[PDB]
Design an enzyme around this catalytic site. Structure first.
Site, mmCIF file in Angstrom:
data_model
loop_
_atom_site.group_PDB
_atom_site.id
_atom_site.type_symbol
_atom_site.label_atom_id
_atom_site.label_comp_id
_atom_site.label_asym_id
_atom_site.label_seq_id
_atom_site.Cartn_x
_atom_site.Cartn_y
_atom_site.Cartn_z
ATOM 1 C CD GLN A 19 -2.681 -1.519 2.367
ATOM 2 O OE1 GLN A 19 -3.076 -2.683 2.466
ATOM 3 N NE2 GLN A 19 -2.772 -0.650 3.371
ATOM 4 C CD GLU A 20 5.683 2.493 3.301
ATOM 5 O OE1 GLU A 20 6.179 1.347 3.254
ATOM 6 O OE2 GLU A 20 6.313 3.500 3.701
ATOM 7 N N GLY A 21 3.477 1.529 -1.532
ATOM 8 C CA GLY A 21 3.895 1.579 -2.921
ATOM 9 C C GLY A 21 2.847 2.135 -3.863
#
Ligand SMILES: Nc1ncnc2c1ncn2[C@@H]1O[C@H](COP(=O)(O)O)[C@@H](O)[C@H]1O
Length: 399
Positions: free
Chosen positions: A126-128
Site C-alpha cells: 500500500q505504501e507503494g
C-alpha cells in the site's frame, strides 16, 4: 474544496501532512506551500510499554492540523493515520493497543472527520501504490494511458517497494500467490498497478542482509578501518573492513548473493528472491525513486544537498562506489559530512553498491537509464513530499 489530513506514523517518528484540494482535485496553497507538514520524534514504536503516551505524542501534530484547517472544514475533513508495519514486530498485543490508543485519542481530542478505519497499519504494498498515486498525481498523469505513467521505487529503512502500472493483459495474467501483485485502483480511469514490497531490502535492513553473507568475518563492503557492530532490529552484525579495506568487486559479489538473484523463479521473469518482476514495459520506463534512492546521492555529493531531487542513472551510483570503495573512513567522513550526521560513514561503499545492484541486477534497470531520485517532487513553484501521504489523501478525497 476538501482538506485532507494524513498522519504517517513510521518507525522513527510521526508526520502529519495536510492538503487542500480544490473542486477539480488540484492542490491549493496553504500559505506559501502546497503541502503542510510537521514531524515529531520518537515514533509510536518507542511507546510499546506505554501505548497511552504513543497517542498523547501525536497531540501536537493533531493540533497543528486542527489549526491549519479552518474550523469550517473540520467535520468534513478526512483524518487518516497510517502506521508502518514495523509495529507488528512489537511483542504481544502492543501493536493493537497502540493503534487503539491512537483511535481513542483521535475520537476524544479531534474535531475532524474520524472514521472507524482512520487508523491502520499501512504495509509496503500500500505504501507503494499510494506513492505511485503521489507521483503521478503531481506529474499530471492521472487519466493518461498506463504507458505514459511514471513507475515508482521507494527505498525505506526496512523494505523497498516497486509499483508501476501494467497492461490489461498483464494484469489478467499475473500470477496468484502473499501480498497480491496487482492492485486495481480507479482515479476517472482504471489502473492496474504491479506492486511489490520487499522486506529486509530497505536501506538499513539491506546492510544486515549484506553483512550476514560474511557472518563473523571481515566484509569487503566495509571501509578501512572501521571495526564495529551494526545493529538492525535488535540483531548484531560485525562490520569490520578487511586488512586492505573495502573492495568494489568483492562487495558487489556479496551484495549480489545477499539479493538472492539466483533464488528460483516460478514465473515469467523475476527480480530476486523468487519475486515476479511485473513484466516490465512502458509503465516502468520512466521512474521516480524515493527516499533513500535520493538520500544516498544527496549524501555523497551527487547533487547540491539543498536540492530535493536529481535526475541520475544507475551507473552514476556505480562510478561513485568505485571511488568511495577505495577510501577509508576518515576520508569518507571528511568528504561526506551528511553521512557522518546519519551514522553511516562505514557503509558508504556498501550503500552505493547496494543501490546499483538493486536497481540493475535486482530490478533490471538499464544502468544508462536516467531516473529521477527525490525526496520531494516539484508541483508548480512548490515542493510536495515524495511519500505515500498525498496519494492516500488523494484516494481518501475521491471518496
Ligand atoms: N540522509 C539520510 N540518510 C539516512 N536516512 C535518512 C536521511 N534523511 C532522512 N532519513 C530517514 O528517513 C526515515 C523515514 O522512515 P520511517 O521512520 O519509516 O518513515 C527517517 O527515519 C529518517 O531518519
Amino acid at each position: 474544496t476538501s482538506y485532507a489530513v494524513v498522519f504517517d506514523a513510521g518507525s522513527t517518528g510521526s508526520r502529519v501532512h495536510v492538503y487542500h484540494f480544490d473542486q477539480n482535485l488540484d492542490l491549493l496553497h496553504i500559505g506559501k506551500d502546497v503541502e503542510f507538514y510537521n514531524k515529531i520524534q520518537p515514533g509510536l514504536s518507542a511507546y510499546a510499554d506505554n501505548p497511552e503516551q504513543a497517542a498523547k505524542s501525536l497531540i501536537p501534530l493533531l493540533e497543528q492540523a486542527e489549526n491549519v484547517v479552518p474550523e469550517d472544514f473540520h467535520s468534513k475533513t478526512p483524518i487518516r493515520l497510517g502506521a508502518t508495519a514495523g509495529l507488528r514486530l512489537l511483542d504481544g498485543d502492543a501493536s493493537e493497543r497502540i493503534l487503539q490508543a491512537v483511535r481513542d485519542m483521535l475520537n476524544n481530542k479531534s474535531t475532524f472527520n474520524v472514521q472507524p478505519d482512520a487508523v491502520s497499519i499501512i504495509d509496503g504494498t500500500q505504501e507503494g501504490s499510494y506513492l505511485w498515486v503521489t507521483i503521478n498525481y503531481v506529474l499530471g498523469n492521472l487519466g493518461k494511458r498506463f504507458t505514459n505513467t511514471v513507475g515508482v521505487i521507494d527505498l525505506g529503512g526496512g523494505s523497498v517497494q516497486m509499483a508501476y502500472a501494467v497492461s490489461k493483459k498483464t494484469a489478467r495474467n499475473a500470477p496468484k500467490v502473499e501480498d497480491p501483485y496487482i492492485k486495481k485502483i480507479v482515479l476517472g480511469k482504471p489502473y492496474d498497478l504491479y506492486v511489490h514490497s520487499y522486506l529486509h531490502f530497505g536501506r538499513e535492513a539491506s546492510r544486515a542482509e549484506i553483512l550476514k553473507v560474511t557472518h563473523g568475518s571481515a566484509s569487503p563492503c566495509i571501509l578501512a578501518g572501521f571495526d564495529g557492530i551494526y545493529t538492525y532490529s535488535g540483531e548484531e552484525f560485525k562490520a569490520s573492513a578487511p586488512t586492505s579495506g573495502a573492495n568494489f568487486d568483492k562487495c558487489k559479489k556479496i551484495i549480489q548473493k545477499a539479493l538472492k538473484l539466483d533464488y528460483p523463479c516460478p514465473y515469467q521473469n523475476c527480480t530476486f528472491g523468487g519475486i515476479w518482476n511485473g513484466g516490465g514495459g512502458s509503465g516502468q520506463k520512466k521512474l521516480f525513486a524515493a527516499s533513500s534512492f535520493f538520500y544516498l546521492p544527496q549524501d555523497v555529493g551527487m547533487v547540491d544537498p539543498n536540492k530535493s531531487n536529481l535526475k541520475l542513472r544507475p551507473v552514476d551510483l556505480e562510478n561513485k562506489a568505485k571511488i568511495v570503495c577505495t577510501l577509508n573512513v576518515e576520508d569518507v567522513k571528511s568528504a561526506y559530512p551528511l553521512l557522518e550526521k546519519f551514522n553511516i560513514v562505514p557503509y558508504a561503499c556498501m550503500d552505493l553498491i547496494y543501490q546499483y545492484e538493486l536497481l540493475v541486477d535486482g530490478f533490471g534497470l538499464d544502468p544508462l537509464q536516467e531516473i529521477t531520485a527525490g525526496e520531494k517532487i516539484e508541483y508548480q513553484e512548490a515542493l510536495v513530499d515524495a511519500a505515500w501521504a498525498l496519494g492516500n489523501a488523494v484516494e481518501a478525497v475521491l471518496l
